[PDB]
Subunit: 342 residues, 5 copies
């Protein structure tokens, strides 16, 4: 029979379907099964404490009032324009800060109804979600980004969200991030929100992201080591080259301070000490100690042969003492940051 007649016959004023009434108005709660497909992930900014995602959201529920038997086809696709005339759950994202649909040529929405009355709804969304981040162990850190799906208006007597037993989250093939590695394990847990207005269903997903070290090594760790070695070079210069040694010390100190200030150019103003901060503090301490060493040598050398050998002995000791202590610090730093991290 004519396709146009069946649609309004089923969902029209003649039938009596009301899209403001739940499938079972007084009865067991509606059970909604959800799965998400991630099409792109990125735009993770520490400063604005947020990340941007683009996902496909699928919802499944049973509506006994939409059961159709007469029509031959087992499964019926429909038109996106008729979504307004069916009941839909009022899902919202609790941690969302921005959202929008897509209307690129048409509404990016799908609807499918089965003979038994099952409904499949798929929609394309773009979300900016908030993610609290811990910045300790900042270079060698693992973050967790959550996404919470909640009901705004229906209590647990009416609506109950659940996860699909197989394949709740799948990621698009070939998706990669410049600064992070997305772990394949996703944690599916139950959250329930309590307010003065009642109890509301909630579901959550946790994503594990590991930062990549190559950029930080090429950028910060290696120039600091170069400045430390440059300061070490001064121990092999003649003690009579006072302007040269003093200029080298001052330049190294100022460069170290500038790099330390610039290492936090793209981070939130946190109030604790990070690993990069410990590293820069130790390197600045070494450079300053080298300058103080030459200062002591110069003070000793003008006290007039006993004073000559004593000042030379300081230079010889510092030539084999500064690299050894820095090597010990590097061993202690890199190990414990592969132990405290885990």
């Amino acid at each position: 029979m004519s396709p146009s007649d069946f649609l309004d016959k089923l969902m029209g004023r003649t039938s009596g379907y009301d899209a403001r009434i739940r499938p079972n108005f007084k009865g067991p709660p509606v059970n909604v099964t959800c799965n998400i497909f991630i099409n792109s992930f990125g735009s993770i900014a520490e400063t604005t404490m947020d990340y941007r995602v683009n996902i496909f959201l699928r919802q499944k529920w049973n509506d006994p009032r939409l059961a159709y038997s007469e029509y031959p086809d087992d499964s019926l696709d429909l038109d996106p324009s008729m979504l307004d005339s069916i009941w839909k759950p009022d899902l919202f994202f609790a941690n969302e800060k921005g959202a929008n649909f897509h209307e690129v040529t048409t509404d990016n929405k799908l609807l499918r109804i089965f003979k038994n009355g099952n409904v499949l709804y798929s929609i394309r969304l773009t979300l900016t979600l908030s993610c609290p981040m811990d910045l300790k162990n900042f270079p060698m850190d693992v973050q967790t980004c959550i996404m919470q799906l909640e009901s705004f208006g229906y209590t647990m007597n009416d609506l109950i969200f659940e996860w699909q037993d197989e394949a709740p989250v799948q990621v698009a093939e070939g998706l990669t991030l410049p600064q992070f590695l997305l772990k394949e394990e996703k944690d599916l847990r139950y959250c329930t929100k309590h307010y003065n207005t009642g109890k509301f269903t909630c579901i959550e997903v946790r994503f594990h992201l590991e930062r990549q070290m190559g950029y930080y090594l090429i950028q910060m760790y290696i120039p600091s080591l170069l400045i430390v070695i440059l300061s070490w070079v001064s121990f092999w210069i003649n003690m009579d080259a006072a302007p040269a040694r003093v200029a080298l010390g001052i330049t190294t100190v100022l460069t170290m301070t500038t790099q330390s200030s610039g290492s936090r150019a793209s981070l939130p103003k946190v109030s604790y000490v990070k690993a990069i901060d410990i590293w820069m503090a130790v390197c600045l301490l070494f450079v300053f100690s080298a300058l103080l060493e030459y200062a002591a040598v110069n003070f000793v050398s003008r006290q007039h042969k006993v004073f000559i050998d004593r000042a030379k002995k300081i230079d010889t000791i510092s030539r084999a003492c500064f690299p050894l202590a820095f090597l010990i610090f590097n061993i202690f730093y890199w190990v414990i940051y592969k132990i405290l991290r885990h």
Copy 2:
């Protein structure tokens, strides 16, 4: 009886409800009770003089025309689509600079009507609110952010906003700020606006925010102290190292000026003196005084043995005089800024 019939029977042309007429058209003013739930707080920018918040707003009032007795249920939830057909107050935020609703999958709105005629309306909002800030005592400052709820069109004869006796403001669990600490005490006060058009109800809430010092200590206070100590190092160098001492003085002066200029990189161009400005001024004065000291010593030393001991005595006095005066300044600074602040 059928759910669909009751809704239009109560709120339809047949009943005669008009959403443009107040619950008591000529009579005592409508009393509206409000409470807010804060779901996220952040984005506090000194430059743009504003902060961003995301809140849930609940309004309660009594409408005698909506009293229902026949239906069995004590409390009736409804559909968000029918909000257009009920009377709602015209609340607006006086200090608002931007606002938007959420339509992530549906309208984020709730409505509930009770047997007696009481209505509960809940809506999700995102607001950018303006906050005047005082920048004196800038590192050690406590700010106050206000939010004002006012009626645009109804005078006090018609509409009166009030606060709920229990729990007007609650904050979501685990909410934290990177640079601030939100105090638990909130001040509930009465504001009333007077214009040439009449008298209008207003309500206000004040939030107390205390800045955290760790970032400022790691960033500004410690490098300035390092530069001061670096300038102090010059007193232990031989007076004959004129290029070395002059280069050290010039480098310290230029670095101090650059840090002083950069300490106000992310602040509004205010016209008063902040504490950080006093600190940088004192440190620049100390560095310049050290350079002037070596200048005087060099001028004295070339006046040709009496001139030799006098110039050496200046260096010995300045070696125990510059640290003592700076220690006294640090004691006087840090105390009074823990006394004038309170």
Copy 3:
């Protein structure tokens, strides 16, 4: 009588009111009285040549077709939803670059009708308005920001805008600006626009803003003076300290040039000379002249006792000559910029 009946009886198809026809279709022009209330002012950017304001706009006119006598109340408030069914003037802002209404919980609009037929319309607006600025006397400047209200479609035969005799402009209490002081005198003048399409009514308001000097003093004027004094210090160093004196001169010159380049970091690329530019040019000239002085002294001193006293005499003269000429320049600069400004 029933409130709902009177509204459509007055403004309905039964009555014959047409919102597309003026109050007097063929007759004397409609006279509209306007007043504005300023709720916030700020966001004055020299680069984007614009400023942002948030105002309440009130319009008053007489409509003889809306005269009501039967109803007892002298003054009738109404609902914002019915604005579409009354005639309203087509006011627009000629200098506007951006605008938006507010829909925070409802439309921020008010309407009131009186027995005689007078209408009061109040609306909340946010406007980004363009302001041509003159940058000469840039630190010590007084700007004027205009706002023009004009009719887009009606000629002077139909619509005539006027200002209210008492209180056209009032400002909200406690409004302050970080970098400017808003003067209390506002200039109310008549503007009329002439085009190839006809004559159109226009009204304008001028606001006087005076820049505050504290920020510029702390930022630019004082470090430049410090660099000049630092260059002056070189006159007291021994003439044999050639590397020290040359390094001091080069560092001062480079620092002066960098500060001069950075003094125009946040301004439009204008093609004339500002006062700050004159100041930096004079300070750079003084620093360069000091370097040229030491250059001449060093050239003279190696010409081999007559050459010894002549070179020393140059240093002694320059020690009392450079501060005196700079003091004279400061006197001439600061006076005339308190005379030419007025």
Copy 4:
């Protein structure tokens, strides 16, 4: 007769007017006359290759179906709300990147119909238009900004756009630009687009903009000359001041390189050589040559009286040789850039 009746009598279902049918459905093409009024011009960014304009657009055409004779008035203004019910051309801007209407208090639109059937339509628009720019002769450049008006859906058999014989483009009085001078001559030319879908009418306007040099002179050209003179100063220093001369050379070289890098901070990454690039290259070459000169002098002077006079003779020759060659370069540069530009 009643004003309301005439409007729907002329343009209503009773009359049979169809706004989807052209004035002459099968017949000579519709001829549309256009003129634009420019109210503000600015926001010319080289990086984003675009400029922002705000214009009033006037369209004129004849519709024989709208001819009215009975009504007394020769010319009838109308209401903006009825624009949807008349046929309008489908003008679009081919080079447009962003556009928006204005709804500040009402739609900023005008419509007027005459007895003969002529229609005048005026609308307010804000456009961001794309402008290809040639960056050779970058300081002394003249740009051309185009704006193209085209029909999207109608071929030349149906629609033909033309320019008005008198006053197509007029500019608002007092309009000025910070960095450019708008020439008074505007070029009116005919463009026609050819696609696989057919032939479409197009019209274009070209605006000539000349850059102002004051900013570039104060910013780039003068500090480079100062650095060149500073390097020249080294020729008058004693040849025994090796650290001083070497430090001066290195500082001048590094400063020159930094200024050369910073001269292209706000420009697109083009792949050709600009005039500023030639200038900085020549100045860097002069500074390096001065350093190489002192290097050669120092190498010659330690070859041990014949070697003493030869090295002094090099300094004396370079003291009168470097300024002369730079003066010749300045003469050749500034002339040809006032000849090749024209």
Copy 5:
């Protein structure tokens, strides 16, 4: 016959056309032919990993229900307002991140129907599309930007997208890019997406972009070479000029490090080594080696005639050894990067 009658006679309730039903509801799949015209290309940002395009999209398909014979004209243009009443495919862009239509004066849309029932639909779109980029060989790189057209709701039984046999992609005449060269060969390939909901048609286009080297040569490669030559200059200075040589070495090292840090100012934080990174590493190694050479020479020279000739011999060897090794490195670098790239 009257034009208005034919339109609703063909596509009206009287005819029975339903825009929610496919041209052949149960039958062979609908075959859609597509071609795109590119009007502007640009805004390629490595940081935000995306590019902006502005295209015209043409779709062609056959609808047997729209076959018209009676009307004389072979081809009928129509009005954009009636697009809502015809069936249209639900094309979407899978890699899209932002999109918008144009409404500059009217909807920028075209529709044309032929006698046989063929439909041509043309629409103007602006798209921000995502493009994964490989940054190895960063200066000498060739990128590929894809654009994917997919069906959101229809499976392959219903809808099948295909490319036109002649001229699928054409580019507007005179289109150029500042930093890239668009290759004339475009790759047309078949993509099909598989999901848990079914099989969906997809089509893709690949664009090849080659980066231009002029900007990178003028900006990065040449100043680094200048710094290397500047460090080479130190070999010709007297070995007794210890402050001069040490200052030259330190300044060159610090400048090299600053340029290396600044070479990645506008790129994503990738974790691999680029060619520019290899170049800066080699240049920094050469500068440091030069400083270490002078350090060794100074250490050797103070070991007290045998020590005098040995230290001089080191300087003479390094004067002909450093340029030769750097020339060999330049030969090996530039060749293999013209071989590994291809």
